[PDB]
Design a protein around this nucleic acid. Structure first.
Ligand code: ZN
Length: 252
DNA sequence: AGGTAGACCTGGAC
DNA sequence: GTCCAGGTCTACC
């Protein structure tokens, strides 16, 4: 799930779990649990706590309990659902939080790439995975100034830059390729080669692109298809070790 | 010093 | 077999 989807999950999951108290935590794939390292400690510390809120930082959901925060990243396929403890579990359910009301928050992930970290609340923002997180892309803290400062300081591509969570929080691959196309900038361009005008323009498309989706694709996944703006076939290559799509005529 | 390219994970799809 | 994939996690200068 990408930032806008995580935001929808955050909004819709909260009312379904707020005020419930954890009676048990069952883990079927311990590797998902990254902190505490022992999945038995992770399970024991959460029992007895009540869910008080649910926030989002980048693509990370932050479950707020009485004493602890549970920080969860779903990666590509992770999913949460609330259902009855009386019903059989769906496939690929790796972690289940059982509440005292007979309902359960179930985490499913066919790829098992998702992660969970639990810490005393006041410690979460200063520990992994939230600690080096850059600013929300839709906040005033993510500014052209900030983006320029990071761009002129690295030898990496503009795409590698946008993909860096310390630069901006949770801006995924699809949004990076769509924003670069809307801004008219090739993804393989050295970040340091961008002009002020290009930076400002990239910043504005990033916000509109992800802003529109938080509330149809030009290039992502459209390779071999004609560009929606000019008809030239979209091209796909690998930049920053990821699938990268762009219009060769319109992006410079 | 620390910026940075590769590697790790995992299973379904080509 | 071979191929992705996010936010790490090494080594490597
Ligand atoms: Zn075009």
């Amino acid at each position: 799930p990408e930032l806008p989807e995580v935001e929808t999950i955050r909004r819709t999951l909260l009312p379904l779990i707020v005020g419930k108290t954890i009676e048990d935590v069952r883990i079927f794939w311990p590797n998902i649990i990254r902190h505490p390292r022992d999945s038995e400690a992770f399970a024991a510390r959460m029992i007895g706590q009540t869910v008080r809120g649910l926030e989002r930082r980048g693509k990370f959901l932050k479950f707020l309990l009485d004493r602890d925060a549970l920080i969860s990243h779903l990666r590509m396929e992770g999913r949460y659902a609330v259902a009855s403890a009386l019903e059989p579990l769906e496939p690929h359910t790796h972690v289940v939080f059982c509440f005292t009301d007979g309902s359960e928050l179930r985490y499913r992930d066919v790829r098992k790439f998702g992660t969970m970290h639990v810490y005393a609340k006041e410690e979460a923002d200063r520990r992994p995975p939230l600690a080096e997180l850059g600013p929300e892309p839709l906040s005033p803290a993510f500014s052209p100034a900030v983006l320029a400062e990071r761009a002129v300081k690295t030898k990496r591509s503009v795409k590698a830059l946008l993909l860096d969570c310390t630069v901006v929080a949770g801006f995924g691959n699809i949004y990076v390729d769509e924003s670069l196309f809307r801004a008219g900038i090739l993804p393989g361009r050295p970040a340091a080669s961008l002009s002020s005008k290009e930076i400002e323009r990239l910043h504005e498309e990033m916000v509109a692109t992800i802003g529109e989706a938080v509330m149809h694709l030009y290039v992502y996944g459209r390779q071999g298809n004609p560009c929606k703006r000019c008809g030239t076939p979209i091209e796909k290559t690998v930049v920053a070790g990821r699938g990268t799509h762009y219009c060769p005529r319109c992006q410079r």
